Design a protein around this ligand. Structure first.
Ligand SMILES: O=P(O)(O)O[C@@H]1[C@@H](O)[C@H](OP(=O)(O)O)[C@@H](OP(=O)(O)O)[C@H](OP(=O)(O)O)[C@H]1O
Ligand SMILES: Nc1ncnc2c1ncn2[C@@H]1O[C@H](COP(=O)(O)OP(=O)(O)O)[C@@H](O)[C@H]1O
Ligand SMILES: [Mn+2]
Length: 271
């Protein structure tokens, strides 16, 4: 029905939502409304001011649905900008929170020096996260589910193997063959759109998600969201979005992820 049902605020207009304006994200949504990918992203209506702050006026993707189930998939083999690697080398901001969150999952993960600092760099933390999830090997990872019964979970930090990922989607679709077939049709059409998109070939797409939304009426949709770390390549250079990331090549592995995601849902459909 609606997401509002901490970047988000309720909109005055029916079927809209407000998201805290960020300059990279605003730039991307404006380009996307004129791109092949227009229909694959939430409608962007422009910027509005609320309590002296800038917000993006977005389509509420949950509006068409009756008690929506939602799954957030973060796309890419890499989940941080290359500029974070430079910053961490020349001017590291040691993160005590990231050390604790790492220690919690694997007490042998931090180095002797990280234990001594009780702190890690952001890129180090995000690289570790990529490796214990499916990000590094499959090019995406499950971040969170919201179920129609009001329940939610973010407990996927060690969801890594092809079969572990399949079991999460299997539980998500709860044997609804119509929802799964509609998800697969939508991902096939999104892949086709990404492969021809002028935007996609000229941008590094980091930290974006695919949002899966379905209901008990068998309505199913998928959209790309979260363009806060999507940036254009300099002087008309392009990415293939499949080849491995090597510092300087700005590759995101986005389509490696989408290929693997389509493969898993196609496998689930035949179970
Ligand atoms: O707690 P964990 O392991 O999930 O880690 C979170 C990181 O601490 C956070 O960095 P930050 O702490 O510098 O904001 C990420 O923000 P950005 O990568 O967007 O800068 C966030 O990504 P998200 O906002 O969820 O897309 C990760 O999930
Ligand atoms: N346009 C939208 N309509 C409805 N729900 C949305 C929309 N965009 C995002 N969401 C919800 O908000 C969550 C966070 O979105 P995201 O854009 O990644 O924000 P953030 O950068 O603050 O993490 C999504 O996983 C989804 O549940
Ligand atoms: Mn996010």
């Amino acid at each position: 029905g609606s997401h509002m049902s901490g970047s988000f605020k309720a909109a005055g207009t029916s079927g809209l939502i407000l998201k805290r304006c960020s300059e990279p994200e605003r730039y991307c949504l404006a380009r996307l409304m004129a791109d092949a990918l227009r229909g694959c992203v939430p409608a962007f209506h422009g910027v509005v001011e609320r309590d002296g702050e800038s917000y993006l006026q977005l389509q509420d993707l949950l509006d068409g649905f009756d008690g929506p189930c939602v799954l957030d998939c973060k796309m890419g083999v890499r989940t941080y900008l290359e500029e974070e690697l430079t910053k961490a080398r020349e001017r590291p901001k040691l993160r005590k929170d990231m050390y604790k969150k790492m220690l919690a999952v694997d007490p042998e993960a931090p180095t002797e020096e990280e234990h001594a600092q009780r702190a890690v760099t952001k890129p180090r933390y995000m690289q570790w996260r990529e490796g214990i999830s499916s990000s590094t090997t499959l090019g995406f990872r499950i971040e969170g589910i919201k179920k129609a019964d009001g329940s939610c979970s973010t407990d996927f930090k060690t969801t890594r193997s092809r079969e572990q990922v399949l079991r999460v989607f299997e539980e998500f679709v709860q044997g609804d063959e119509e929802v799964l077939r509609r998800y697969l049709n939508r991902l096939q059409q999104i892949r086709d759109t990404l492969e021809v998109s002028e935007f996609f070939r000229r941008h590094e797409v980091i930290g974006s998600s695919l949002l899966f939304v379905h209901d008990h009426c068998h309505r199913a949709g998928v959209w790309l969201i979260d363009f806060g770390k999507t940036t254009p390549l300099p002087d008309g250079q392009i990415l293939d979005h499949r080849r491995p990331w090597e510092e300087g090549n700005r590759e995101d592995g986005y389509l490696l992820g989408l290929d693997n995601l389509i493969g898993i849902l196609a496998s689930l459909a035949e179970r």
